């Protein structure tokens, strides 16, 4: 059976997406580069806040120093913070709170593996907090996905090694980094979205912990 569940934040837990657009479309506006549009913005889903910004830099083609670097990262998050704060326990994805739930009560260490600095805040604005066991902090990885950094930190976190725990992601890099971690992926949304060789699901509200079950008795050998 497994010993942990590793969780992604943004696409399994909750949808950050907008919130991050609205502040990297403003950042993208006020240094004048044109492209951050919603069709743009699906290319930085899952992706660090640094590798965002060069990606915005590179609409381009934008160059600017270290330190200018810096301050444009900081002046997006700033924004992107200002406006997480009415995120609620009304914006936890559908499934998950029971989930959550579920797995605590059968003593199944949960921990955060997400790329968003921002994650500790999330979890207490959603009133999650007391159930994660361990957040992995993107700040001492990385190797940002797809390298396994940030899941193997998640499993280590809580006690466990990744070939006892499940990986639960939305994105192909994040689904990438759960198996060459060693932990099982199970993968949300469509599969062109996700990967190969994984079991997914259309969404979160298929994450119960009875199909956990199954599907890690289905890849043990
Ligand atoms: O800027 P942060 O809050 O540290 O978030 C870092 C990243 O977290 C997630 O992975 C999101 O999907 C990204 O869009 C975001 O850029
Ligand atoms: F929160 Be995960 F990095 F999408
Ligand atoms: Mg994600
Ligand atoms: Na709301």
């Not at 890099?173 to 079991?199: C, H, N, T, W, Y």
């Amino acid at each position: 059976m497994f010993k942990a569940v590793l969780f992604d934040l943004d696409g399994v837990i909750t949808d950050t997406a907008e919130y991050h657009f609205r502040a990297w479309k403003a950042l993208a506006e006020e240094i004048g580069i044109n492209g951050v549009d919603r069709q743009f913005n699906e290319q930085l889903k899952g992706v660090s806040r640094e590798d965002s910004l060069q990606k915005i830099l590179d609409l381009a083609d934008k160059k600017v120093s270290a330190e200018e670097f810096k301050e444009l990262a900081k002046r997006k998050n700033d924004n992107y913070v200002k406006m997480i704060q009415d995120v609620s326990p009304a914006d936890v994805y559908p499934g998950i709170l029971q989930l959550l739930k579920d797995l605590r009560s059968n003593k199944i260490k949960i921990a955060l593996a997400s790329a968003s600095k921002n994650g500790p805040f999330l979890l207490e604005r959603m009133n999650l907090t007391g159930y994660f066991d361990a957040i992995a902090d993107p700040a001492e990885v990385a190797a940002s996905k797809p390298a396994p950094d940030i899941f193997i930190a998640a499993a280590h976190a809580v006690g466990v090694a990744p070939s006892e725990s499940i990986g639960l992601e939305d994105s192909q890099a994040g689904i990438q980094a759960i198996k060459d971690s060693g932990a099982l992926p199970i993968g949300v949304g469509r599969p062109e979205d996700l990967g190969d060789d994984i079991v997914i699901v259309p969404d979160t509200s298929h994450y119960t912990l009875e199909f956990l079950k199954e599907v890690w008795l289905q890849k043990q050998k």
